[PDB]
Amino acid sequence: DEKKDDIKEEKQVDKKLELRNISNVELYTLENNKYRHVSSLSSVPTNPEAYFMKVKSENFKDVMLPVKSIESARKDNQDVYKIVGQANDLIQHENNITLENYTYYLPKTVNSENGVYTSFKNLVDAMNINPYGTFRLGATMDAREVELSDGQESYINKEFSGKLIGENKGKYYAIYNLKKPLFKALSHATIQDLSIKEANVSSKEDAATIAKEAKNDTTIANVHSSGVIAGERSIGGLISQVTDSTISNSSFTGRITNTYDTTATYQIGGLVGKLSGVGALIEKSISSIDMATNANTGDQVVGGVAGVVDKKATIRNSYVEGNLNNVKPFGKVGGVVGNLWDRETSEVSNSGNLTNVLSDVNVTNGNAIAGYDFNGIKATNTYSNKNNKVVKVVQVDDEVLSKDSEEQRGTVLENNIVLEKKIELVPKKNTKIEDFNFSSRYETDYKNLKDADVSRLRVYKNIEKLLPFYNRETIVKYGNLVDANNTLYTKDLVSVVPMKDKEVISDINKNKTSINKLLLHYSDNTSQTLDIKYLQDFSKVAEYEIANTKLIYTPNTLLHSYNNIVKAVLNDLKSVQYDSDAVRKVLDISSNIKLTELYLDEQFTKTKANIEDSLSKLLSADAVIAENSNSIIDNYVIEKIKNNKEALLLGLTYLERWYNFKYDNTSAKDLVLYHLDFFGKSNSSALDNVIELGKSGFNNLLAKNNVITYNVLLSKNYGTEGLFKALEGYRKVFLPNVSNNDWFKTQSKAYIVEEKSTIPEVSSKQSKQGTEHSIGVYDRLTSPSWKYQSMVLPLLTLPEEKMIFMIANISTIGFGAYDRYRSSEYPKGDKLNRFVEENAQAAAKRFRDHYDYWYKILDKENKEKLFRSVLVYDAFRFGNDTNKETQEANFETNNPVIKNFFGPAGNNVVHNKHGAYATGDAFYYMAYRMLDKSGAVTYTHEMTHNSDREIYLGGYGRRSGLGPEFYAKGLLQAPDHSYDPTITINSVLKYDDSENSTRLQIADPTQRFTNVEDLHNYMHNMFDLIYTLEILEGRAVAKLDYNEKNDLLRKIENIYKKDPDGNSVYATNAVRRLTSDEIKNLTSFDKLIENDVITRRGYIDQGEYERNGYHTINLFSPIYSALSSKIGTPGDLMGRRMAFELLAAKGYKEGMVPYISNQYEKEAKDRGSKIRSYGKEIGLVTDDLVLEKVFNKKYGSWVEFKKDMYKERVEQFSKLNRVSFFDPNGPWGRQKNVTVNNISVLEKMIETAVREDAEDFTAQVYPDTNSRVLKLKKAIFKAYLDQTKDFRTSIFGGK
């Protein structure tokens, strides 16, 4: 019945190892017992084969394989060498023909004449043999080919040096990865069109990229440099010391750093360290520098573009666009030139010369153009920008300042900068030879291969990540077997093998044990873990079948045996010591400098004890070695490790110390040290990365510079953009769907507390992980506008879990230490912990309350400016268990808090003697403690210092004469205690039923102030009572006799002294005794206001007051005076009193902001009241202008305003007063109820108290205890403040 019909089936394919993607191959040798590169140096067919090939690639890492034979042949009648590699079952494809082994053709020497163009080793050897001559470049050429040193300080170490080094044969070329000065001496040369791209030079001597010196007419031209530079005794962007040389049209774009405290002369500059010739010039030159220096003495001259400029050396049409940053203002620091003045006996006729020089620097602790300003300055032209020229000047609290050595210009720089219109060149990248890829884009058949589907090119390019080292036919087969619905149809980055979230690298060690998982990382940043089981014992390349996809997976390693290498180099790797001289040789360091700032004292022995496993994993992830029995490549690997053992161990220690955190049980040291291909960029190798990090030098390995080191050295080996972007990428792949702030808080061992404000709207704003409004500490530590970004890595890598507590809030983030509150009453365990945790929560709540009050009070969209981040350190005065003492322990100390934090965070505290001080963008608790109750009030004080100029005021700066401590102590800082009889506003503290006797303040600021108008009502009612009491006492002291009036009353007065600027307009209050005629004038209450009378009871001063002083105004001591400084600033006592009176009368924004916050500067300038302060033409706001603006024309003088306020209070109270005043007024034998019902009783009692305190004068050290008037006023104030809830009403009206 059935008729047999055949079925034609597809044919099965043979699988072989193949190298599809190839960039360029390199041949090595063992000719002189050391492994050296050979580049066409093979001139004859070599007799024996001790060579080996290193086939680089751009898809994955290189594949070192030995050489089977060498023969001379011709591919196209040109003499080439048939270098044939070798592998177990390798295969090579050429025009659809399978060759048994990999063969490339190495041509002999090229005919390129008139210059050595090949490679860096050839170039430097030629220039060493023949210093004269012309040496162009033929290709973009890297500088790590040269072994870089025996003890030398430069690549070319001859005086004469590359007299004509062009770098444009037909197109411009570049030199990569420089590590030392290029020439060490330059004399009569004509360097031209060179372009160094990534230079990392570090020399204890004078350090610069293209040369150390320039003796004769060396015409540098079009030489563009870049990269980081670190020096110790001089620095130069291109040349450290030029004489008689014209560095024209060059540039420099990188970082420069000399932060050592050496007491020696150095001339560091971003372009040239010193010009010292009559014919020296710098023309059409740019300098994008990021310099962080430390001058410390008037001889070290940081210099921006150029350092010392001497003997009529010019700076023409130059330009600098960076961020210079000195530490101390002592040395001569300049934005453009550090010193224009001669070092010999200097006549002005031989000074430096500038012309058409701009400066877009954010220079700190230095001038803006020239560091040294003198009478005969010779700039003759210079421009600038509106940027930060901060110079840290020291008051009792530090603060910013300007320098005023500048010619100012607006923001037309985007046009003024492009006078030299050249913007672009085209430096070529490193060249490649070929690509033996099988999939050719041209279509001989509509299918590229035999079985190649045009719809699945992305599937093939994803399979090429799953299956490296496999023939192209098997690649297309497994591409065709990919399921249609499978998610391998999207772009794929490289995959990793976790083994149940462990990220294994040693595949030879762990192939037998099934790799239980396989993490696929996609371009969408989405991840996907697959299950894989070790399928087939293909020992060359381990094969893992995916669970149910029918595909396979082969890890990118050949399961090579590293036992020989490990046992060979372990002995020489374990005989390395941190304090040895070898470490001081691998680090380009002197003998005076100490290795404390590395903070790798313990991790060094940790990674030296555990060196074998990490070394095996590093070799496994380094490269690919294809051998069975010979050791021609193992010897090369052991030589590479042995020659760089110190650098290897230092890089390994650094990367293990600062990257110990984990993403959900997957350590990040594995993903950082190993698996460089996690973000793409599989070209890189782990061992070379670790080596080049180790050789980076002392400055790059420094603990403070972890983020910068990553960004400028560790990046472009991983493919990332920055350190925090890399951490975010790792968090996106491992542990997804969790905000990175939550990951940081669950990884960091610091006790982080974040208090979101109680207002619903701001809480909703903060609870969103989108930055610029978030409260999360990680969203602010990693964001720009945060100076110390190197805080993140130490915070993640914290050892002991009880050493640091972190208080974060709106507009602040504060760091502390458990060991600060340690004492004999609080030992190390289970008591200090609970105390610090509870007090940290309480202090965070108090700080949140403070900024909640200020967020309510601010109205003119300044509340949007309350989202800043100002750090708050603690004392560093760590305690001990035995005594209740403290040790400062700045740095250099073995306290684990200092070593694990506060040291890696590169912040050094000045360590003043008492109190707390503010820096203007930071805040430190020297004597007070952040977790105490007084910590809140001092925090308020110094935050009013920090946020005075911009946030608390309407953005208008402080007034002309008012100092930083005019605002804090008397106006905006919360009172020290509850019972303080001072006119302040309670913001932070909250009293609980125990201070309710002698309270005299607001107990609940979170419930009292709910708007600006609530603050205005509170102040208006408090001043209603204050004015009532002042009226009552004034109407008594006016009805009084001669001597006792003279005793009770004193006259305040304004005396003007010369401010250390040019002006003498700012007033200073002075309390003096008053004359007989003035006393005889005092016959009523109005005359007390007229004659400037003050009360001696409270303000015990009898002499002049002081500017910038901690003065406060008492509630009960009357100041009958209305003192107006028609000349200028009013003073520090009457200033506070008038500010509070204006806050009582007018609102906070309409009054007391105009009075104290320079708001009418524009109108003062328009009306002619202009002055000159520190060379700046600034308006002067006389108090009469303030009165005219706050109140339109109602009041003509402050005396009239004061008398009108008193008249309003009088007309209110003379008829209506609350009966509820029930003060007892006596401790023993008291009157049970005064029961004040009409103001006659209050007036009679106040008059009796004043009359009985005029006689029996106190006049002693104790005027507050023994005075009856103060007791009566305090009793009345407390009774009224108790009657009303706080200050909602004092005289009910309407009926």
Residue numbers in the entry: 907 to 2201
What is the paper's account of this structure, in its own sentences?
Many invasive bacteria block the initial mucosal host response during colonization by cleaving host immunoglobulin A1 (IgA1) via a bacterially encoded IgA1 protease (IgA1P). Here, we used cryo-EM to characterize the metallo-IgA1P of a more distantly related family member from Gemella haemolysans, an emerging opportunistic pathogen implicated in meningitis, endocarditis, and more recently bacteremia in the elderly. Third, all M26 metallo-IgA1Ps comprise the M26 region itself that is responsible for IgA1 cleavage, which corresponds to G. haemolysans IgA1P residues 907-2201. The two histidine residues of the HEXXH motif together with a conserved downstream glutamic acid coordinate a Zn ion to polarize the carbonyl group of the substrate’s scissile peptide.
We solved the structure of the G. haemolysans IgA1P catalytic region, G. haemolysans IgA1P residues 907-2201, through cryo-EM single particle reconstruction. A cryo-EM 3D reconstruction of this metallo-IgA1P resulted in a 3.2 Å resolution map that readily afforded a near-atomic-resolution model that includes the active site. In regard to similarities that exclude the NTD2 gating domain described further below, the G. haemolysans IgA1P NTD1, MD, and CTD superimpose well with their analogous domains within the S. pneumoniae IgA1P with an RMSD of 1.1 Å over all Cα. The RMSD increases to 2.3 Å over all Cα atoms when including the NTD2, which is further discussed below in regard to differences. Specifically, residues comprising the conserved metalloprotease signature HEMTH motif (residues 1847-1851) and the downstream E1871 are structurally perfectly aligned with those within S. pneumoniae IgA1P. The most striking difference between the two substrate-free IgA1Ps is that the G. haemolysans IgA1P NTD2 gating domain is shifted to a more open position by ~6 Å relative to that of S. pneumoniae IgA1P. The large shift of the G. haemolysans IgA1P NTD2 can be viewed as a partially open conformation existing along the conformational continuum between the substrate-free and substrate-bound states. Interestingly, both metallo-IgA1Ps comprise an extended structure within their active site that are residues 1296-1308 in G. haemolysans IgA1P (corresponding to residues 1054-1063 in S. pneumoniae IgA1P), which would occlude substrate entry. For example, the gating mechanism could subscribe to an inherent opening/closing (opening/closing of the “gate”). However, this partial opening does not give any measurable advantage in binding affinity described above for the G. haemolysans IgA1P inactive mutant over that of its S. pneumoniae IgA1P counterpart. Specifically, our findings reveal that despite the substrate-free G. haemolysans IgA1P structure showing a more open active site relative to that of the S. pneumoniae IgA1P, substrate binding is still necessary to further open the active site to facilitate access to the hinge region of the shared IgA1 substrate.
